[PDB]
Amino acid sequence: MIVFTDLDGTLLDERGELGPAREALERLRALGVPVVPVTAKTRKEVEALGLEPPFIVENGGGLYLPRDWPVRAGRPKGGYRVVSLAWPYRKVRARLREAEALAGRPILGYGDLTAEAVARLTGLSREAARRAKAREYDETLVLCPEEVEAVLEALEAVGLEWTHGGRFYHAAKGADKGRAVARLRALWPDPEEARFAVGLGDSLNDLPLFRAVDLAVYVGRGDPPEGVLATPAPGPEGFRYAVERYLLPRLS
Amino acid sequence: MIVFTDLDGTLLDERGELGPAREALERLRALGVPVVPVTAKTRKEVEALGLEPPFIVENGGGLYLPRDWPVRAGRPKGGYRVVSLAWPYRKVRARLREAEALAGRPILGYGDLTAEAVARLTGLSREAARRAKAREYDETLVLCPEEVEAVLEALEAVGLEWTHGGRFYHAAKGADKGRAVARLRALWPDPEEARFAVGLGDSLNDLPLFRAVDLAVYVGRGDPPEGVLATPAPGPEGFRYAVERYLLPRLS
Numbered sequence A, B: 001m002i003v004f005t006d007l008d009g010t011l012l013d014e015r016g017e018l019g020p021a022r023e024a025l026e027r028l029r030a031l032g033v034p035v036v037p038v039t040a041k042t043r044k045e046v047e048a049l050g051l052e053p054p055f056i057v058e059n060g061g062g063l064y065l066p067r068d069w070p071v072r073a074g075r076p077k078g079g080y081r082v083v084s085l086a087w088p089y090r091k092v093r094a095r096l097r098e099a100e101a102l103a104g105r106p107i108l109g110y111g112d113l114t115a116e117a118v119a120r121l122t123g124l125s126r127e128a129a130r131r132a133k134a135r136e137y138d139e140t141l142v143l144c145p146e147e148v149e150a151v152l153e154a155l156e157a158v159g160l161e162w163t164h165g166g167r168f169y170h171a172a173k174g175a176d177k178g179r180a181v182a183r184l185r186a187l188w189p190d191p192e193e194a195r196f197a198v199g200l201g202d203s204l205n206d207l208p209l210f211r212a213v214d215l216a217v218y219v220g221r222g223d224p225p226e227g228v229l230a231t232p233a234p235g236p237e238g239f240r241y242a243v244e245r246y247l248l249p250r251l252s
């Protein structure tokens, strides 16, 4: 069993801290069940949470492996090996300029904004904002609600893909959580261990995650996606519940 | 006679240069007629055009005088004395943060954007965009169309004033072209020379300029405001025509 999990809204509280998920995580760790973050966050953000590879960043754009991963894949990015699945950020940003020209209205993303501006928009500290701006694949968009329809069509027109991470729309090409999870599973050292996969999440960017796993659990607010399991409480308390009620009974 | 002149679309042509207006200006110079730029541009932008003081920047937010101006006014700053008529950019930005809280939605402006983003949104080079970002009084806003009215009400609630500059909305407090013109006229060394003021502009947003002068000339497209003279051709062509038709005969 491998547990693939979103970070924001799932494993982290609304303050963005691993506090409440501790018990649940240590439980999984004590039972030697691998937990793999699969997130919209950048590598710098994931590192700042103290999380170690393997992990999947920027909506599946990059798969980070430990340098000594037993299965050789990706290129050394120092201390890590990285499997790049999506276009690099610079190319997404260039293509966004074309979408903007098509749309005839500004399309702003983190790359257009100061760290101070991003901090003010996200509630993050200045330092956290810098790490959120350090993007390698995916762009976080800051869209007018009323312009979303026109903008998304312009993204599609110019060959970009879009998703939503819980609060913001994102633009990328080739970044898919499910594709990244499937790749990581295929690169897993122990085939038996990767044979059964669990996925937890709460946002639109997680539907591809739910489809790439064998057991999907939704810990967001409102109704679960089609035929996906639910929990009585959202976020980390939902994560804890799922571990205790869905996973442990499966590990016996 | 003093000639107060708008820059963009008035003294400057489509390529941001001179042309027909160069000869017109040289002619005014020769007759000893002061020409005073009055512009939405920042002092850094005005300097990049090679323009010497006195001039009025940021829609009347600041009046720049030569350091050795015969009438003592303003605060010394290098080769200038500066009469600040409006709140400083820093205070405007802080009030904008308050307006954001009232409007319950982000209010972004140039201070939140990189020079590259400002360049892209305005069609300027990165270098010119850096100069447009060096703002001392007025903030340029990038507002969602459907959120404008909510934003503008919020701006006013926190004590800001707003204008629409053709492309973007602006926020400031105390920045008015007419007040700046009246101030400069009151600070003119030779009162007789300041008794008759001409104001040339190309926009309806030049109304405050037009009201503060004795002879108003519109060199913009379409109909001029009521009580404002018009020229057959727009831009520098109009500037040249206006100088030939309205001003030159007066000095003879």
Ligand SMILES: O=C(O)[C@@H](CO)O[C@H]1O[C@H](CO)[C@@H](O)[C@H](O)[C@@H]1O
Residues within 6 Å of the ligand: A008, A039, A040, A041, A042, A045, A122, A132, A140, A164, A165, A166, A167, A168, A169
């Ligand atoms: O899309 C979102 O709702 C969140 C979900 O994690 O991701 C963005 O927003 C987060 C901050 O709220 C950043 O940490 C991520 O890097 C990304 O920019």
Ligand SMILES: O=[P-]([O-])[O-]
Residues within 6 Å of the ligand: A006, A007, A008, A009, A038, A039, A040, A041, A165, A166, A203, A205
């Ligand atoms: O970590 P993000 O996809 O909420």
Ligand SMILES: [Cl-]
Residues within 6 Å of the ligand: B006, B007, B008, B038, B039, B040, B041
């Ligand atoms: Cl101007």
Ligand SMILES: [Mg+2]
Residues within 6 Å of the ligand: A006, A007, A008, A009, A010, A165, A166, A202, A203
């Ligand atoms: Mg999420």
Ligand SMILES: [Mg+2]
Residues within 6 Å of the ligand: B006, B007, B008, B009, B010, B202, B203
């Ligand atoms: Mg103008």
